[PDB]
Design a protein around this nucleic acid. Structure first.
Ligand SMILES: NCCC[C@H](N)CC(=O)NCCC[C@H](N)CC(=O)NCCC[C@H](N)CC(=O)N[C@@H]1[C@H](O)[C@@H](OC(N)=O)[C@@H](CO)O[C@H]1NC1=N[C@@H]2C(=O)NC[C@@H](O)[C@H]2N1
Lengths: 215, 100, 50, 136
RNA sequence: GCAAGACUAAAACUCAAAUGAAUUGACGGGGGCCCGCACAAGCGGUGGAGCAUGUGGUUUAAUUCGAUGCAACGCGAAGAACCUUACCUGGCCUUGACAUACUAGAAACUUUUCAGAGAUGGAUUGGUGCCUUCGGGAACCUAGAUACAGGUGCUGCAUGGCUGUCGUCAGCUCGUGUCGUGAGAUGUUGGGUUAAGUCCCGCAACGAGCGCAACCCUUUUCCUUACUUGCCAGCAUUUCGGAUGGGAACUUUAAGGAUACUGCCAGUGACAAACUGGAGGAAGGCGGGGACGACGUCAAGUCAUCAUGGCCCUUACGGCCAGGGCUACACACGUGCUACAAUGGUCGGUACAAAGGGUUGCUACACAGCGAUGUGAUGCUAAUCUCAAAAAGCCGAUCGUAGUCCGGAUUGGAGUCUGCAACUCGACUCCAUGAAGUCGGAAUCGCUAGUAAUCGCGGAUCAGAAUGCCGCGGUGAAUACGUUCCCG
C-alpha cells in the first residue's frame, strides 16, 4: 500500500518545520508563494554546492535564509562576493532585506538528500544501479547510521519494462513516531526517461519529545 | 494549465487593476441620491460601456505554481496537489496532520 | 490525496493560532527601553499598545 | 457475537414509579429519541386506568403483562424469560396502535383494560402462537 | 473358433517430445480449527411516488475530456449565465499571448474620440522620464531576422511522483549450524492463551529485521501557574442590566503535571502464560475516538495538476474574440432529499447548545415595505462588537381520519439582490394553483451505545449559485440464545 510521508507525519512530533514565521490570512499566501520561489531559485543555483536544507524565517519586516551545505567554501565564494550576490538576489525576490546564513554539514553520509543526489548523479552517469545502491548503503552504515533503506524505480539499465529495486541495512522503524528518520526523494534524468530515488536514514530514537526538541 | 490560459488570467488582472478606480467612481455616482437622475443614468451607461475584462467577476483563482483552476484554497494560494506536496515536505509553517 | 479520482482518500490538515495577553502596570522608566531592546524571535508576532 | 458474551444493558428505573417494567414499556413505545412524548403516552394510560377502575397502576400492568406473556418459541423451544416480556410489549404496542381514539395514550389504556378481560389482538396473537405450537 | 473374436504381426506418415519419482505453491462441491454486523436476534432504510444529482443511451453544430464489478456512477468538479472552457458556428493573427540568442529606433506611459459583436484598426492630447568614468547605459515599448516558442494533441502497455484494493488482514523475511545428489527442509512446526507471529511451555536448531503493541492528537477525574476582552461565591451601591465599586472564590480559557500498574482480596489455570469475581477509585483489565496501513497483488487509476522518453501539428492539432453548448430528452440505472400524517399539521406563549466565520467583511438600533430587502446609523482587525433566531422540547387552543387545516410538485401573475449581462440558464420573496403520493414485489443496504433514529447550527469552494462534502452539538433506543447453514 501507500505510505505516509515520514517527515510530514512527524512535523509536530520530533521534527521542526522548514519555515518559521507568522502572517495573518491577508499576507499568508503572498509570503508562502515568495518562499516557494526562493526555494526553487536556491535549488537551481546551488545544484553543485551540496545543499540539502533551506530554512526560511521572517523575524521582523526582514528575512533570514539558513542554507545547510557540505560545500561552505563554494557557497560562500572566493572572497565572500557570492553570499553578497545571493543576498541581493534574495532581497530582489522577497521584497524585504534578507540575510543568508551558512550551516556546515560535517557528516554528509547521514543526510538523506545528499545520498539521494549522489545516487541520482551516478545513475545519470550510467553506473550500475545495484552497485550504486550497495555502495551508498555501505558508506552510510560506515558513517554511523543505525539503518538505511534505498529504493530506485523506473527503467533500470534501459529495460523496456520498468521495475523497483530496494536494499536495506540495519533498522528503519517507520511506524515509531519518535524515531529520527530522514527521508529524501530525487530524480535521475536518463536517455530513457526518469528514474526515481528514495532514501530513508534512521539515526536513533528521540526521547523527551517536542519539549526536548525545543519547538 | 496552458501558457495561453495563464497569460489570459494575467491580462485580466492587469485590466481590472487599470480600471479599478473609474469603476468605483461610477458605482458611487450611481449610488448617489443627491445626484440627478440623468447623472446616475449616464454613470450607468459609462459603467456598461467599460471593457468587459475590467469586471472582477471574470477573474478565476488559479494555483500559484501550476495554474490549476480547481481546488484553490484561498489561504495558501495553491491548488490541492501542490498544497499536499508542500505541507508534507514541511515548507508551510504551522500546518500539521489533524487528528481529534 | 489522489491526483484523479478517490473522494474518500484525503488528508486532513489543521493550523492553530495561539494568543497570549500580558499587562504591565506601574511601568518604570527602564521598562519601555528594555522591552524595545528585547529581541524579536521569528514566528511570534508582538503588538504593543499604550 | 462469536466468542464473547455481551453483558445485558441495564436500564434505569423510571423516575416516577421506580419500575423497570414501565421504563422498558416506555422504551418500546418511544420513537426517534422522543422520550417525553412516550412518557406522556404511557403515564396518561396509567392515570386513566386508575380512574376507570381502582387498582395499583403498577400491579394492574404487571398482571396484564403476565396474561399476555407467551411461553413457547416457533422444532419446538421454550422462550427464555426476557423474550417473554420483550414479545408481550411488542404485541401490546402493535395491537394498541390500530384501535381508534383521539390520543395514543387513550388507545393504550383501552387495550390494557381489554387485555385484562381477555379480549385484544395481543392475546389472539398469543393463542395463534399457541396453535402453531400445538401444530408441531 | 459355431459366432463374438483370440494368437502371430508390419509399413507409409507425423511430433520433439511422451514419461518416473520427488519439491514449492495454488485449488478441491477433501478433513480438522478460528475470526468478522457473515449469519441469527433487533431498529431503521433502498427497490414504489415527486424532486435533486451522476452515469448509460438517444439527440445535436457541439452536447469538451477522463473515471467502468466489489475497488466507476453527489467520482476529478472545495461549487459551467460571461469567465472557467478544454467543445461548436462565425470573425481574425502568424517568431506568435510567453522564453533565450542578434540587429535598430523610441522613456515607459497618458487624454479625447471614430468604425466594429468584439478581437482589432484609425485619427488625437499631454509626458518624454533613472544612472552616469557621463561619447552610453538600466528597465520598458515598437520594427526586422532564425534557431525556435506553443500544443488539456497520442502512448498510464515506455516512465517519475501520487492514489485505490485485498485490508488494519497477521503475517513476511535473513545469518551460522544440521538433513538431502538435488529443487529444498529445519528454524517459523508441536500444547495452552490473546484483538495480534500477543505471551508462556516443548523441540537440530542457535541467533536477528520489518510487521503487532507503545511513543503522537482528542475526551473523562484532580493539582500548579496564569485573572482579561472571560467569571460573580462573600461585601456595598444600584436605572435590578456583573450595571457599578469591588473579589480571585467558582465556571471557563490553556500550558505544564498527577493518576491505572492486575496495584489489593478471593477463586481457578498447570504446580506457567493467562482467565472469572470483589473493594476502593471519576475511571479496571484494550475506558472511548483519531492518526499511523508490513512483504506483496491487480501491465488497477492518473501523460487533463505537475514532471518526463518516444511519436505527431507548425498561416495550425498554436494564439485572440463574439454568440452557442457542457443545463438537450421516447428511455434505463446508481446515490440522495421531501412525503404519504394525530408519537401529527397550524396558531399563541415560553426554555436549554456546541463548533465555526467576519475589514472588498459581519452588523447593534431606527425608519419604509406583507416580504425578499432598501436607506440612515453604530461597534468590531474580535473571550470585547457581530452572524444569531438554535430546532426538536414544555404549556394552551384547534383540526377529528378526510387525499384532509396531510403533502408541496407543477403552472399563471407580480417583485428583490448579485453581476457589464439572469432568454437559453441564478438564488430568494409575495399572491394564486394544489400533482403523484394511503408506507411501497422479487431482492437488497446501514448499524452492537451516547451507537442507530430524529432535530437544528457552521464552514471550504465562492460576485451570486448545496438536498452534495467536511464538521458541531440537542433528545436518545431495541437486540445479541448461539455458529447448524449465507458470505469472506
Ligand atoms: N493504444 C496503443 C498502445 C500501444 C502500446 N503502448 C504498445 C506497447 O506499449 N507495447 C509493448 C512494448 O513494445 C514493450 O513493453 C514495454 N514496456 O516497452 C513490449 C515488451 O513485452 O510489450 C509490448 N506490449 C505487448 N502487449 C502484448 C501481449 O500481452 N501479448 C502479445 C504482444 O503483442 C505483447 N506485447
Amino acid at each position: 500500500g501507500q505510505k505516509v510521508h515520514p517527515i510530514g507525519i512527524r512535523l509536530g512530533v520530533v521534527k521542526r518545520h522548514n519555515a518559521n514565521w507568522y502572517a495573518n490570512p491577508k499576507q499568508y499566501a503572498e509570503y508562502l508563494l515568495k518562499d516557494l520561489q526562493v526555494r526553487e531559485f536556491l535549488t537551481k543555483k546551488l545544484k553543485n554546492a551540496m545543499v540539502s536544507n533551506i530554512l526560511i524565517e521572517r523575524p521582523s519586516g526582514a528575512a533570514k535564509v539558513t542554507i545547510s551545505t557540505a560545500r561552505p567554501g563554494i557557497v560562500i565564494g572566493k572572497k565572500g562576493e557570492d553570499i553578497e550576490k545571493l543576498q541581493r538576489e534574495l532581497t530582489n525576490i522577497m521584497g524585504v532585506p534578507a540575510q543568508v546564513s551558512i550551516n556546515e554539514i560535517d557528516r554528509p553520509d547521514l543526510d538523506a538528500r545528499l545520498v539521494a543526489e549522489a545516487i541520482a548523479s551516478q545513475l545519470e552517469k550510467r553506473v550500475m544501479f545495484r552497485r550504486a545502491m550497495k555502495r551508498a548503503v555501505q558508506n552510510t552504515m560506515r558513517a554511523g547510521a543505525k539503518g538505511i533503506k534505498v529504493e530506485v524505480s523506473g527503467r533500470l539499465g534501459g529495460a523496456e519494462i520498468a521495475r523497483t529495486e530496494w536494499y536495506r541495512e540495519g533498522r528503519v522503524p517507520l511506524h515509531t513516531l519518535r524515531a529520527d528518520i530522514d527521508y529524501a526523494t530525487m530524480r535521475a534524468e536518463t536517455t530513457y526517461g526518469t528514474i526515481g530515488v528514495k532514501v530513508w536514514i534512521f539515526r536513533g530514537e528521540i526521547l523527551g519529545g517536542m519539549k526536548q526538541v525545543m519547538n | 494549465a496552458k501558457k495561453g490560459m495563464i497569460n489570459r488570467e494575467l491580462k485580466r488582472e492587469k485590466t481590472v487593476a487599470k480600471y479599478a478606480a473609474k469603476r468605483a467612481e461610477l458605482k458611487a455616482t450611481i449610488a448617489n441620491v443627491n445626484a440627478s437622475d440623468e447623472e446616475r443614468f449616464e454613470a450607468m451607461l459609462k459603467l456598461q460601456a467599460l471593457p468587459r475584462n475590467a469586471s472582477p467577476v471574470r477573474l478565476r483563482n488559479r494555483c500559484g505554481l501550476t495554474g490549476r483552476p480547481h481546488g484553490y484554497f484561498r489561504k495558501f494560494g495553491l491548488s490541492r496537489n501542490k498544497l499536499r506536496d508542500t505541507v508534507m515536505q514541511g515548507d508551510v509553517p504551522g500546518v500539521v496532520k489533524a487528528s481529534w | 490525496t489522489s491526483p484523479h479520482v478517490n473522494k474518500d482518500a484525503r488528508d486532513q490538515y489543521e493550523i492553530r493560532t495561539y494568543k497570549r495577553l500580558i499587562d504591565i502596570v506601574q511601568p518604570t522608566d527602564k521598562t519601555v527601553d528594555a522591552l524595545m531592546k528585547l529581541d524579536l524571535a521569528a514566528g511570534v508576532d508582538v503588538q504593543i499598545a499604550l | 457475537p462469536r466468542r464473547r458474551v455481551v453483558a445485558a444493558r441495564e436500564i434505569l428505573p423510571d423516575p416516577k414509579f421506580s419500575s423497570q417494567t414501565i421504563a422498558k414499556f416506555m422504551n418500546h413505545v418511544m420513537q426517534d429519541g422522543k422520550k417525553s412524548i412516550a412518557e406522556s403516552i404511557v403515564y396518561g394510560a396509567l392515570e386513566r386506568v386508575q380512574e376507570k377502575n381502582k387498582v395499583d397502576p403498577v400491579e394492574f400492568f404487571e398482571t396484564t403483562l403476565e396474561k399476555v406473556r407467551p411461553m413457547v418459541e416457533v422444532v419446538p423451544m421454550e422462550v427464555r424469560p426476557s423474550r417473554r416480556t420483550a414479545l408481550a410489549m411488542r404485541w401490546l404496542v402493535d395491537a394498541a396502535a390500530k384501535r381508534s381514539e383521539k390520543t395514543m395514550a387513550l388507545r393504550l389504556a383501552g387495550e390494557l383494560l381489554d387485555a385484562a378481560e381477555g379480549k385484544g389482538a395481543a392475546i389472539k396473537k398469543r393463542e395463534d402462537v399457541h396453535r402453531m405450537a400445538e401444530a408441531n
